[PDB]
Amino acid sequence: MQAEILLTLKLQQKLFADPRRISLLKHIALSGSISQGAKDAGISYKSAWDAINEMNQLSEHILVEAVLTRYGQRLIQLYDLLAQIQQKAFDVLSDDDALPLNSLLAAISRFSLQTSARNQWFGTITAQHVDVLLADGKTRLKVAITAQSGARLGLDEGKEVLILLKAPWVGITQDEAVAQNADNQLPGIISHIERGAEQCEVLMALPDGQTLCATVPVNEATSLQQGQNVTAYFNADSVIIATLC
Amino acid sequence: SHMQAEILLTLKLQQKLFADPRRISLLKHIALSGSISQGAKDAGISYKSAWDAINEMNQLSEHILVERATGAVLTRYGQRLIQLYDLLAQIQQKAFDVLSDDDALPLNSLLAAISRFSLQTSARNQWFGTITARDHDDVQQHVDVLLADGKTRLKVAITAQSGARLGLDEGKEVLILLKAPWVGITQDEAVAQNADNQLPGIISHIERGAEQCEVLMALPDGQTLCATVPVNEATSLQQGQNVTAYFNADSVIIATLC
Ligand code: NI
């Protein structure tokens, strides 16, 4: 379904920007002149001046110096942003199976935003740190974070969070006495071990479905076997937690 | 920081005008009033143009926006259209404030909009940048990142595989998520000269606490670096002090859209 968005900006109750003025600016950038610009954009020369002069006055910047100033370019960038996201916005709107729309930036960023952390899990703030319940419903974590960063992330009971944990920040132990003194403990079964000259990648099947990745010094992985039940452990302050609002 | 823009959006579907200010305003007054006719009158539009608008919006969207109360109410879709419109308008208003205030991120970038307006993380550093050419002919397991001045360079560790999957080719936009306690702050160049990454600067703000001192410095592109250093190790620091921030390449997590 063809779909588009048109934007008009008004300042002080008057007309500041509208597609025809943005097209005037872009034809000005292209042509290197106001008169050629107006012609390409389809308006009179005097009307191109009236628009540029009104824009300058209402915004209190200078938009055209012919070249555009920085302020002028970024005004076009603000239009280009809208045009970058419209099709995502229309797809969010037409999504008959979605729950109610809370945050359009969070909706368009839930499934596209990816990270380089090999462990990337979803959770909710359950009731200096916060506790997080993972999405398969049983696993709890403790995440070190001040009351104030918690406030800046919007950490309320139930807020969805993204939890990030590099593989080399994860310890792997077969000793319950080591694991029990860790902040976070995730029992699981080793499903793959890959031994290199300095490092060993461990993948572990967590009881509830996802696969945890740890990267440990090889000499610490010597007795480990695929099939074996072990415990992954990490400090509360190793985890990065993110929210989208 | 002054002057809020008034945002006027028009959505068009199938080459036709679908929703504009007047139509969204009609649907909110319908929701507020409980009826088409009181809602059209509150929105300042006649009864007939009100139903002409709703019949059109239904036909274009392939949904029903308004239905008789089981009195008129918005359906799920009528509510979703108003929500999406108003969130969209709010994103253009915040973008306008960015234009007015300035910053060095591109204002056309979606990742930069997410970073400014939606994403927050516990790491405290969340810098915008772009994948740039490796800075050595030899392949190493790291990407190079330029900050928004297109000049200040960082290295981040990652494998070719996770780099590939994330689409990390020249020009890809990423965020650098770097915990504050993993950032050093030094007045001694040699100390920092031993780390993968050094970012010179000036302390723009210092806060001291019993165990940790928080330091804030402007990166050369305007973005803000935050570091948390042991108060033992921060006793000689002060605002305006010229400083170098330093960190390992494997301390970073890269975020990017895929
Ligand atoms: Ni490099």
From Swiss-Prot, chain B:
Source lineage: Bacteria, Pseudomonadati, Pseudomonadota, Gammaproteobacteria, Enterobacterales
UniProt keywords, alphabetically: Activator, Cytoplasm, DNA-binding, Metal-binding, Molybdenum, Repeat, Repressor, Transcription, Transcription regulation, Transport
Region I, annotated ranges: 3-117
PROSITE patterns for the chain: MOP
UniProt record similarity statement: Belongs to the ModE family.
Disruption phenotype: Loss of repression of the modABC operon. Not essential for molybdopterin cofactor synthesis. Increased dmsA expression under aerobic conditions and reduced expression under anaerobic conditions. Decreased expression of hyc and narG.
Protein name: DNA-binding transcriptional dual regulator ModE
Assembly behavior: Homodimer.
Mop domain boundaries: 120-187, 192-256
Regulation: The ModE dimer binds two molecules of molybdate (MoO4(2-)) with a Kd of 0.8 uM, which results in major changes in the conformation of the DNA-binding domain and confers high-affinity DNA-binding to the transcription factor. Additionally molybdate binding moves the 2 Mop domains closer together, trapping the ligand between them. Can also bind tungstate. Molybdate is bound at the dimer interface using residues from each monomer.
Role: Functions as an intracellular molybdate sensor. The ModE-Mo complex acts as a repressor of the modABC operon, which is involved in the transport of molybdate. Binds modA promoter DNA in the absence of molybdate, however molybdate binding confers increased DNA affinity. Binds the promoter of moaA activating its transcription; binding is not enhanced by molybdate. The protein dimer binds the consensus palindrome sequence 5'-TATAT-N7-TAYAT-3' and a variant 5'-TGTGT-N7-TGYGT-3'.
Effect seen on changing residue 121 to I: Transcription repression by ModE even in the absence of molybdate
Record GO terms (molecular function): cis-regulatory region sequence-specific DNA binding; molybdenum ion binding
Subcellular location: Cytoplasm
Record-annotated DNA-binding residue ranges: 35-75
Region named Required for dimer formation and molybdate binding: 121-129
Keyword flag Manganese: no
Keyword Transcription (UniProt): yes
Biological process (GO), any one: regulation of DNA-templated transcription
Description of its domains: Deletion of the C-terminus (from residues 122 on) results in constitutive repression of modA. Contains two major domains: the N-terminal domain I forms a winged helix-turn-helix motif and interacts with DNA. The C-terminal domain II is the olybdate-binding component and contains a tandem repeat of the Mop domain, each of which forms a beta-barrel. The N-terminal domain plays a major role in the dimerization of the protein whereas the C-terminal domain contributes to the stability of the complex.
Expression induction or repression: Constitutively expressed at low levels; probably part of the modE-modF operon. Does not seem to be autoregulated.
Residue numbers binding molybdate: 122, 124, 159, 162, 179-180
Disulfide partners: none
